[model samples]
Target: EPIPVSDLRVALTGVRKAALSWSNGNGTASCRMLLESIQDSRLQVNISGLKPGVQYNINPYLLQSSRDTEVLLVGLEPGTRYNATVYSQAANGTEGQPQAIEFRT
Candidate 1:
């Protein structure tokens, strides 16, 4: 069965960072980020709330940790528009419904 990520929240934490969190534990969460303009800026993030003893990787890198529930995005350009989409992936590789948000940094 596919269980969608719920209660997704996106907040700006700083001039170059934002936090994304969700309220689902049935699977791993993945995010896709889109910027309005192309630049040489680097993007990074920290993932929390992963299953203990299991290693998981997002689009650009990997993360390993115990259950927590937040993703800290870094290296955003100020005054730029961004689009972030978050979704859940089941253990069987099933993708769930996506929740998205747009904002300016």
Candidate 2:
């Protein structure tokens, strides 16, 4: 069975890298990160330039061979809290059934 699309998560690895990980209630799917600042049709985040010890609002998404969905991750402080959200994306770019969560480092 397909997962409900609200089980995605995002976390920071050792305060140096941000990871977007998700489970489809069966097997995990490929995950991607994006910044809210970007206006591109797809979610693409560049973390190479992000400053250390700062909090950033982020978005994580699950991507299959041709499908994708975007979710929100907010107030990510280095060595601190890691927030996550999960939702499904429609073909027309609308979000659905968002499930939100947060964690700490």
Candidate 3:
């Protein structure tokens, strides 16, 4: 038996701020990121110094209870195009299908 991953999501809070939240896929306490465009892979980070009225892409790799990883995308633009994806991982480093989503900022 293994821990199951659950709904992962991302959102923009302010002009230059974003928030990431998710439920325990299987009620775990640790996680990690498999692939992310951003360099930071600390599971959690704050993005600032953004241009007003400008749109940016936010993709996060999620992990739980020391599991593998998952992904979530947030489109934070007034009127622009954005894309995102997420993947699940197993203890043996097994990667699941990637979930992709697109939207306007």
Backbone N/Cα/C clashes per model: 2, 0, 13
Relative to the unseen true structure, what is the Cα RMSD of model 3? Answer: 11.4
CA lDDT of each prediction against the hidden true structure: 0.52, 0.37, 0.38
lDDT of 1 by residue, 1-105 (tens): 346556767778788676766665545543223323225444443333344223332433222114335656565677776665655556655666766677676
Poorest 10 consecutive residues by lDDT, candidate 3: 62-71
Evaluation by lDDT, superior candidate among 1 and 2: 1
TM-score of each: 0.61, 0.38, 0.39
Model 2 RMSD in Å is: 11.6
What overall lDDT, based on C-alpha atoms, would model 2 receive against the true structure?
A: 0.37
What shift in Å separates residue 68 of candidate 1 from its native position after superposition? 5.7
Kindly indicate the candidate among 1 and 2 with the higher TM-score.
1
Query: Can you write out model 3's per-residue Cα lDDT over 1-79, one digit (the tens) per residue?
Result: 2243345455655543344343334433333333322213223333332222233345433221133332224433344
In model 2, the runs with Cα more than 4 Å from the true position are: 1-6, 10-12, 23-76
